[PDB]
Design a protein around this ligand. Sequence first.
Ligand code: X56
Ligand code: MYR
Ligand code: MYR
Length: 573
Amino acid sequence: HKSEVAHRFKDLGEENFKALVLIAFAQYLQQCPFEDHVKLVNEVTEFAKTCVADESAENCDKSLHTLFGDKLCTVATLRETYGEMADCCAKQEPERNECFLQHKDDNPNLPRLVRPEVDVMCTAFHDNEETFLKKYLYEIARRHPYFYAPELLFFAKRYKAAFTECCQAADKAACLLPKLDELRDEGKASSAKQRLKCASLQKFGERAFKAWAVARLSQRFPKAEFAEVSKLVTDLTKVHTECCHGDLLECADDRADLAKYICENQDSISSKLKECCEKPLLEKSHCIAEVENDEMPADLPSLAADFVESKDVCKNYAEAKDVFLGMFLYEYARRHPDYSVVLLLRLAKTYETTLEKCCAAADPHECYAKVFDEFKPLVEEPQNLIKQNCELFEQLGEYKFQNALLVRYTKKVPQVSTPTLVEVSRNLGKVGSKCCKHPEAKRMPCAEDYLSVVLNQLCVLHEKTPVSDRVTKCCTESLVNRRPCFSALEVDETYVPKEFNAETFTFHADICTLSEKERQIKKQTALVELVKHKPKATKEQLKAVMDDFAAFVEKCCTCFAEEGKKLVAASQA
Ligand SMILES: Cc1nnc(SCC2=C(C(=O)O)N3C(=O)[C@@H](NC(=O)Cn4cnnn4)[C@H]3SC2)s1
Ligand SMILES: CCCCCCCCCCCCCC(=O)O
Ligand SMILES: CCCCCCCCCCCCCC(=O)O
């Protein structure tokens, strides 16, 4: 490749090239207007087509990083605005792109994005669709500088699906808003999940990540041998390790190389990956991560023969403990795709803790003969918590389930802030609406995904503003010990009730004119403060206050002053 800029333009295409270039300059120059970035993109695009025409043209032989860094310091307002980022342009090309990665703010102090009216968006979508969709990538990339740009390019594609469909129906806000809200959350979930796995490499190390990958790749590729999975884990570990460093180009080629090997060794990996290897190079690595799990081999034997009914186990473990433990994990995961990844890790650790003291004393086979019995309480514990909560969700509704959870978690950790308790209990109830309609097969895997996002978001606000001692210990623990720790929280018997402030429970007629969503947040906020003022209230007592307040908000619709003041004194019992 004499000219790498020409090769990208040929493989990606003009459309995706310009988009990825916009996303690239938005991640670095986050505080730059949309009109300045469009000027850079078209200056890069017009230069790249000269390389496509004449591959031996001036500066076309330069690498992508060299040309990128050069154009990045072409901006005249680089020193005044971004400061130390400009003092690094006096460095050489290999060291220059490293500093540019170390001067990327993950949380830039930018104003919150406000969604305009549906008629305003559909009009901007019609008058000039180019500048409207390009603004979508611009705002997100500058606020999510580590977001994998091809995936951000995948979200921007679905962003045009609803605008093409719902801007042409009767009521445009009927389907445009639900599809925009679904995409907004999935995007925020992907960005949060991406930054979660990177912090897992820092503190917990590579061994923990390689264990996660062994389980997940085996559940996804069950008809593959351990040597193939172990190679996929080693390549994928390098991919995530580099993608967390920030170098987008090095992260994009590593995923392209991994997708090459997987599509070349399909008959040794899986059969469900047949369609997505025909998708373009930009979409290969993305779909492979979301590919459906293949059908496991029919007649897999019991895992007791190679791991319980043998005298070489105690020895084969000593030869390579992590290789042996990885073989156990691969065999347990490929046979049980219905388990969560953290559950298989919770099983493999007990099997590890066993053989350490077990096989290194007296009669080894006599000790680990009943090791699979220890797997019973750990496997059924999240299976019963699923049947408990999903049954409560079915008998109640999403609203009532959240309110049911809003009181259980307030009583367990009352020291947490009220808006944190509200948003937490709401997102937890949305997990039920998403995957309690799934069968037992895909229930626990899905719950693991949404819970890890919600539970980490709960601690992102608690890390910046602590409050609870128990909540700190549950989120500073391991990834496999974070969910069982939170499930091990009970009512805070060592809590002093909050003083009664009738101004809090004082409502106004604005709630009757308020939105159905905002009326939920306000009605749930008073439910928390009520449980904080008197946490020893029974379930039947709270149901009376709640059913009376439902009629109070309906009977009064400035009536909330008179008859509303009767509830505050009536409920004081
Ligand atoms: C990661 C993430 N994934 N999704 C995230 S937010 C996703 C997102 C949404 C949303 O639905 O929340 N958008 C709107 O409603 C638009 N807002 C505008 O101002 C559009 N417009 C109108 N007129 N001009 N521009 C776009 S901005 C990006 S964060
Ligand atoms: C929730 C699991 C997502 C990742 C595990 C499955 C990965 C399948 C192989 C596809 C490789 C794409 C590169 C990448 O995911 O970084
Ligand atoms: C309340 C949200 C609905 C989901 C039902 C509760 C699920 C709890 C079990 C979690 C299973 C995955 C987590 C784990 O295995 O540690």
